[PDB]
Design an enzyme around this catalytic site. Sequence first.
Site, PDB file in Angstrom:
ATOM      1  N   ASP A 412     -56.705   0.941 -13.872  1.00 26.42           N
ATOM      2  CA  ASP A 412     -57.545  -0.243 -13.914  1.00 26.42           C
ATOM      3  C   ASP A 412     -57.325  -1.121 -12.715  1.00 26.42           C
ATOM      4  O   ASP A 412     -56.413  -0.904 -11.913  1.00 26.42           O
ATOM      5  CB  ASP A 412     -57.234  -1.045 -15.191  1.00 26.42           C
ATOM      6  CG  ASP A 412     -58.322  -2.042 -15.547  1.00 26.42           C
ATOM      7  OD1 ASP A 412     -59.419  -2.012 -14.963  1.00 26.42           O
ATOM      8  OD2 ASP A 412     -58.088  -2.861 -16.432  1.00 26.42           O
ATOM      9  N   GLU A 415     -59.929  -1.920  -7.573  1.00 26.84           N
ATOM     10  CA  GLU A 415     -60.986  -2.177  -6.574  1.00 26.84           C
ATOM     11  C   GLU A 415     -60.535  -2.204  -5.091  1.00 26.84           C
ATOM     12  O   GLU A 415     -61.188  -1.611  -4.270  1.00 26.84           O
ATOM     13  CB  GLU A 415     -61.771  -3.466  -6.911  1.00 26.84           C
ATOM     14  CG  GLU A 415     -62.669  -3.339  -8.130  1.00 26.84           C
ATOM     15  CD  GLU A 415     -61.916  -3.230  -9.412  1.00 26.84           C
ATOM     16  OE1 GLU A 415     -60.944  -3.960  -9.559  1.00 26.84           O
ATOM     17  OE2 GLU A 415     -62.277  -2.437 -10.285  1.00 26.84           O
ATOM     18  N   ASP A 511     -66.010  -4.409 -17.758  1.00 22.25           N
ATOM     19  CA  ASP A 511     -66.030  -5.634 -18.570  1.00 22.25           C
ATOM     20  C   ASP A 511     -67.456  -6.012 -18.895  1.00 22.25           C
ATOM     21  O   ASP A 511     -68.092  -6.856 -18.262  1.00 22.25           O
ATOM     22  CB  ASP A 511     -65.295  -6.792 -17.903  1.00 22.25           C
ATOM     23  CG  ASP A 511     -63.810  -6.500 -17.733  1.00 22.25           C
ATOM     24  OD1 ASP A 511     -63.270  -5.701 -18.525  1.00 22.25           O
ATOM     25  OD2 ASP A 511     -63.179  -7.019 -16.787  1.00 22.25           O
TER      26      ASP A 511
END
EC number: 3.2.1.20
Length: 826
Positions: A412, A415, A511
Amino acid sequence: EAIGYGYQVKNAKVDNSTGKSLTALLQLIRNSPVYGPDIQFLSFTASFEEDDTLRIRITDANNRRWEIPNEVLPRPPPPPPTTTVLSHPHSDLVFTLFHTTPFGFTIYRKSTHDVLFDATPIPSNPTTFLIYKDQYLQLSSSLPAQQAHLYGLGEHTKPTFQLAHNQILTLWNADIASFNRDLNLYGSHPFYMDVRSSPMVGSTHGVFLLNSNGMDVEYTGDRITYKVIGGIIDLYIFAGRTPEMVLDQYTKLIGRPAPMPYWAFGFHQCRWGYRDVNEIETVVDKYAEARIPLEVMWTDIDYMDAFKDFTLDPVHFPLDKMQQFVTKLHRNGQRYVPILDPGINTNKSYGTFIRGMQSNVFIKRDGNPYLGSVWPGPVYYPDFLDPAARSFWVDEIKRFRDILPIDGIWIDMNEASNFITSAPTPGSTLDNPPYKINNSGGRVPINSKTIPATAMHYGNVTEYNAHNLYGFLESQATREALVRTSNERPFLLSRSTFAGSGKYTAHWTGDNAARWDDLQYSIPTMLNFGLFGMPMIGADICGFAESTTEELCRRWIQLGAFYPFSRDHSARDTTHQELYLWESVAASARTVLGLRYQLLPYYYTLMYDANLRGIPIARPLFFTFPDDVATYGISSQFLIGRGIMVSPVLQPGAVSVNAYFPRGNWFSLFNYTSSVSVSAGTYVSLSAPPDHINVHIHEGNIVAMQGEAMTTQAARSTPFHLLVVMSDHVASTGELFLDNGIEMDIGGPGGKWTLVRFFAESGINNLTISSEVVNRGYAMSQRWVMDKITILGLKRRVRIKGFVVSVISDLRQLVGQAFKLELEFE
Ligand SMILES: *[C@@H]1O[C@H](CO)[C@@H](O[C@@H]2O[C@H](CO)[C@@H](O)[C@H](O)[C@H]2NC(C)=O)[C@H](O[C@@H]2O[C@@H](C)[C@@H](O)[C@@H](O)[C@@H]2O)[C@H]1NC(C)=O
Ligand SMILES: *[C@@H]1O[C@H](CO)[C@@H](O)[C@H](O)[C@H]1NC(C)=O
């Protein structure tokens, strides 16, 4: 001034020899102060990689520029008025270079002459020009506005699967909640599919810009324009001509979708905010008591000691209790997946940090490790372009896995996400680029809430260029860490992605929110990720952010029970949304997961197909019915495999749903006596009561089912039920892929697999159902049994030697043994 003046062709030749190629040299017409220094001389090559793939590569003639490393994404190397034409005899694609001022190029179909990509400039309009500056690449193609139907250019939340006209799609990996429409999200996929309604209906091609730089893509219907902030033009055109062929061609380039273990298709449960081991044990116990299948239990950052990777909260998740828990899960044929963030906390007493620093594994800026902020507080980011960082990562995972068994990894925040934004390096055009991409819908600076562009990686590589590869690279390393610490087929879930990521990892929509809008949005995203070669896709069921409602969750589990990747996950500040909490939800869940589990062998076959040919598991209606232009614009229905269609209710208070049905006969998988018959494709107002979700199968298809069970393990040992849907127009076919479930290399020459093909066709007075077996070796070794056949789509009953349902029972047939079963009509 004008943005740019474009290029003229200085010279051009067909490379020739055994293999045809096209080389040209281009020269800048005139310099321009806007957007920085123009590249004065360009090398231009057009070449065929396969018959069905044309490559256009445009580079600085005098300087090597940034390219996605071949190691990261292996691929064939580059080749070594007036017009120049390139065409092979076995290729449908024809390339033309136009020596206009400024210059132009096109790709059209040899056969229909249909122009696929048209980069001829409109002389008076520099927005149509090829412009090539160090930090501004502009490439533009005209399009037949109404005839061109475009899909892809991820990752963005949109209410439509088909790209709306008149927007700018920004590609820049960012920690932006997917509940936000339009904004650039966690991943970047500079691929689009272009389906043409005319001149030849359903004729499809693919267009890929192999570039990891930040970009804006402007799509105005009659035109598409890439505006890229670095790298080169490396443009690939895939001939199709079917949508499935386009994806086959595309994944042949960027990587075939990874195989997935069978248990990955089980139901997954997670929550951010589970307080301790006792709570997660309780959840599992309650799923069981609710008779809701639960395959995999997940733990979010809660399990860590102070948000630190490779650690365990010694109070709430102590190792001894965690090992007991996972052991119990495994004993019950269930599985366990924990989360890992990339940011390495800078604690002095933290072994991971210490070892990281020793191997010098971290991303630097101005010569020092770049100091980020995430859940643990101050962190350092491993440089996953650095081999030493890859070893380090593998080693940390080995260490942890040795102590606590795991079955997969959730990666997770990759990015990479940063809770702070660093100050720009003064004078740096990397942290302050001349062209602002439309980051976060607000021309936000790229360094916003991430790693600064001026940060450095292994091989003197700038974050400016490598940024979009971070998650992809973490995925490579993480998969490898799993493969090197177990012989089992690994399972990985990644937030951030790039084109090729699918070769390594599953992805989820991130999300999202507990909103009806989001419920629907999951469908285009799901479909898009199929196009992107990432078929193992899904969305957090009932919604991540915000407290869900009974009705919303009920409709969500209904839909979500058919996501290739089916997980209930929630944010911590919300009411709990485990499926057992509301009775109506639980009831829906048992019914819909029931069907999902019965469909396990099918989803697994589809996963096999995906790895073989790049064809997505969850696919658009137009994949099966490309000749039906009504399907192009559908965004709220989808196929699972070739001929099963899911048609969800996506509105509150609705107890019906208006659903498009392509030509023919369709049968409810929940009640075979329910069918839909349409002579021509059209909408039908399907009944959809609170507990019901519409799932139908089309004529011409055979699906091999197995039985319901509390675990996928158990499910694999149930008898097979064959579902044969007859067609008046064509023979029914179907396919069933079986294996040991660990062969790293699926369907390989290693041979630990079987492919069973089913066939069914009606005579005027008889009916033959038969099977063919490939890899009988492995097939003859397996004790799989078909004990039931159901026959749909006929208006008369059949037996062993308004629509009706015929059922052949007590068969006791080995699946691995080819059969031919003769039936007669009554
Ligand atoms: C470095 O690790 C320390 C121990 O793992 C962290 O201290 C702890 O942080 C917990 C919350 O994250 C807290 O409940 C524990 O009681 C506490 N343990 C100890 C031994 O102090 C430390 O976290 C920093 O300090 C704490 C109190 C909070 O202010 C955190 O927000 C801080 O991050 C970790 N250090 C760093 C630099 O993160
Ligand atoms: C199934 O469908 C039939 C035909 O539409 C209906 O009459 C029946 O009551 C439905 N329910 C079942 C079999 O439970």
